[PDB]
Design a protein around this ligand. Structure first.
Ligand SMILES: Nc1ncnc2c1ncn2[C@@H]1O[C@H](COP(=O)(O)OP(=O)(O)O)[C@@H](O)[C@H]1O
Ligand code: BEF
Ligand code: BEF
Ligand SMILES: [Mg+2]
Ligand SMILES: [Mg+2]
Lengths: 409, 43, 414
RNA sequence: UUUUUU
């Protein structure tokens, strides 16, 4: 008998189940009747601690925003297990008493899919020792797929490891979103062990539904129908949840689209400092988004936080150049996409020379790196379009990059 | 014929034209490069 | 029996040592506190140390390196009378006997100061202040070339030829993001640890990647103080101020200090963040009064005739699309006297070190080179100038790779 | 806000 399980089941099954004993009211009455029997009730959600010291368990069906079925978590419970915003909580609950408006948490069974006692003893995210990415996250399916081309080129141009802090940088309509979707598919197939989250900020609503029905993971969104205030709050919840999972030695990946628009939202809510950078960006506005992107890191103790976010350039607005260059000096991987290549309908429209990854020797074998190095020396003299036409025709001849390398010989 | 085991041209074969002037058949363009005697091995 | 020595030792050895005098449940900080108190009960002396920071009220505390010289729980109170006695000032490394806090107190107190800047306390009363030291151009060359025929040594060798570094230099590794500035600074740090172990090496990391902090502290043989981009600008400023004052104190003791700063452009941004608005803003969004403080920070580096020196090699950013960084870079160029430029064009071809030879250089390089060394570098620059950026580096690296040292390379030039 | 940023 769980609250979110009742919220998921269709109304028809709920009405039948309640007769055996608005939809929100069906669930409420069913839960109360089960409480009358003396049987236990259960609920769950991600914790959000308010300023007063108490918190609520937000639900995914409300994008982790305030919801009618939110579960109150008392301050004493938060202090007992050192809970912090982002902690996924599951436990026994009770309907609200007279003069109350919320379900209350009686006992916490699970904190971050683990024993509550262990959440008292753990090393905090702020204290984890950072590292450059060690373990390679290979995107190439190898299934000889035509979509796989995007993954294969990615592996050659800008490898991705666990804890990477990368950017898919390109002008509007260059292929950033679909490239992020290609990455999401590659992650679900090649790395089902990783905890995949897709954060969509200030982007098209149809892409939200396209992404949640396409990726095998969790999708949190805040479309351009929403104000900047909402974008910020939602992103903060998601990033804190990632940090908690990393404290449990998990390999989390966040595909963010778009991080440029998230930075704009921060610039919208930031207190005016009396100093404004070129493009209309407050001098203090990029500190918060910089810490958000900089969350991504490799941990020596165990686990990692990867963030692959899309960024905008050549928008005519200098603000986006500032944001992009600031994030480049924060991260360590950029896959550039060219409008010139995309207008010729050449996909993936990847600017090979501008793309790249820092310390890529930590993510590649000795000979793989030597082969990529040659390949770059060969592609550099070519034009943006010529480079991709050349590379895609050569890769299309084989199923995998390994066979392509063997052809180079 | 000559084999290259050092640098980018490692794991490749070729022929010495005349330091050793050895070209490597890479992709679809010959790359003539000069390697030391130890940088390459006889075929 | 020293506080920081107890903080360094693992908890296992601390619990065993304390049981010899239940500690398993309590936090490590408590183990140290209880152990220190018990030793004080015996009448035996206790000791502590740290860098001084004087508050506005006239008293100070001894900050610790494990807190990046910020406020810490184990900070040692230094009474105003102690500061006046020995003319102590913020940055002074202090070592002395300490006592646990009494009832109504929250801090360890300093009984007697044994050592002020690794020297006798009386000598700190009598010294010439940093503001009064007579400045000079760099005299003593700090040669970076290992000579071990290493492939990393290439970066050092080119550096020696393009922009020599002397004691008291005020230099900049200028380049766009991902051109090689940080790794070049790491190469410099290695060369300093091997060729100049006498110099006091400090590595200040401001607003840069966190993995580089741990990479640097496990790589360089020196002290590493950091304030990553996870940190606000306020923290960057305060940390940098502590480090620069500590350097000045050591130079007052005729020491040759070197500060490798990455990045000084971001430090200048932090100053612009906390500076009071003047109602006048320069090109790129930089307050008209914002660069005075960072300019004094970079300008601290100088050669002293009386003895010792302060060198600062800091990285700067260019071609970021943000005019602010061009302003900061050009302002620092008119402050310093050495710039090693790195090119994004060379770096994209994977040619390292990606050094822009023509743009690099050092002022008064004749004070850092022999007569013939300077003549050979001069000829070499005349030859490299007509070449392109990339062609210049490929040519020079292929020629240098033929020999182990620059001296043999010069002998080849003949 | 304008100017400055340009
Ligand atoms: N001397 C070098 N040899 C090989 N690779 C280098 C060298 N210098 C830089 N690189 C490559 O460039 C990348 C970024 O260099 P970095 O020093 O971080 O530049 P910046 O500090 O200007 O951002 C590194 O991850 C490394 O792969
Ligand atoms: F218009 Be695209 F999504 F940047
Ligand atoms: F991105 Be580099 F460190 F300037
Ligand atoms: Mg898009
Ligand atoms: Mg760097």
């Amino acid at each position: 008998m769980n609250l979110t399980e009742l919220k998921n089941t269709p109304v028809s099954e709920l009405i039948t189940l309640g007769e055996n004993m608005r939809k929100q009211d069906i669930i409420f009455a069913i839960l109360k009747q089960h409480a009358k029997s003396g049987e236990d009730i259960f609920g769950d959600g991600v914790l959000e601690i308010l300023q007063d010291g108490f918190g609520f368990l937000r639900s995914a069906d409300s994008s982790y925003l305030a919801g009618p079925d939110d579960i109150y978590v008392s301050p004493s419970q938060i202090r007992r297990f050192n809970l912090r915003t982002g902690d996924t909580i599951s436990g026994k609950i009770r309907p609200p008493k007279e003069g109350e408006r919320y379900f209350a948490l009686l006992k916490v069974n699970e904190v971050n899919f683990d024993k509550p006692e262990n959440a008292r003893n753990k090393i905090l995210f702020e204290n984890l020792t950072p590292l450059h990415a060690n373990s390679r996250l290979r995107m190439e399916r190898g299934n000889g797929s035509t979509e796989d081309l995007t993954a294969r080129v990615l592996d050659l141009a800008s490898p991705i490891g666990r804890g990477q802090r990368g950017l898919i940088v390109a002008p509007p309509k260059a292929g950033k979103t679909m490239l992020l979707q290609n990455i999401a598919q590659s992650i679900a197939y090649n790395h089902p062990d990783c905890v995949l989250m897709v954060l969509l900020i200030d982007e098209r609503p149809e892409e939200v539904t396209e992404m949640q029905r396409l990726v095998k993971g969790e999708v949190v969104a805040s479309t351009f129908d929403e104000p900047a205030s909402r974008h910020v709050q939602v992103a903060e919840m998601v990033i804190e949840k990632a940090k908690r999972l990393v404290e449990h030695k998990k390999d989390v990946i966040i595909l963010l689209d778009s991080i440029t628009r998230l930075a704009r939202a921060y610039n919208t809510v930031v207190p005016a400092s009396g100093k404004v950078l070129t493009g209309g960006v407050d001098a203090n506005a990029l500190h918060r988004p910089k810490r958000f992107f900089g969350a991504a890191r490799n941990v020596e103790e165990g686990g990692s936080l990867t963030i692959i976010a899309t960024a905008l350039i050549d928008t005519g607005s200098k603000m986006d150049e500032v944001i992009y260059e600031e994030f480049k000096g924060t991260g360590n991987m950029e896959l550039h996409l060219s409008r010139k290549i995309a207008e010729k309908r050449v996909f993936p429209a990847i600017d090979y020379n501008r793309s790249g990854t820092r310390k890529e020797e930590l993510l590649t074998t000795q000979e793989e790196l030597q082969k990529m190095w040659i390949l770059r020396k060969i592609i550099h003299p070519m034009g943006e379009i010529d480079a991709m036409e050349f590379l895609i025709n050569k890769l299309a001849m084989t199923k995998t990059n390994d066979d392509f390398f063997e052809m180079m010989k | 014929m000559v084999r290259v085991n050092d640098g980018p041209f490692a794991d490749f074969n070729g022929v010495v034209e005349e330091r050793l002037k050895v070209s490597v058949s890479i992709f679809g363009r010959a790359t003539p490069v000069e390697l030391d005697f130890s940088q390459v091995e006889k075929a």
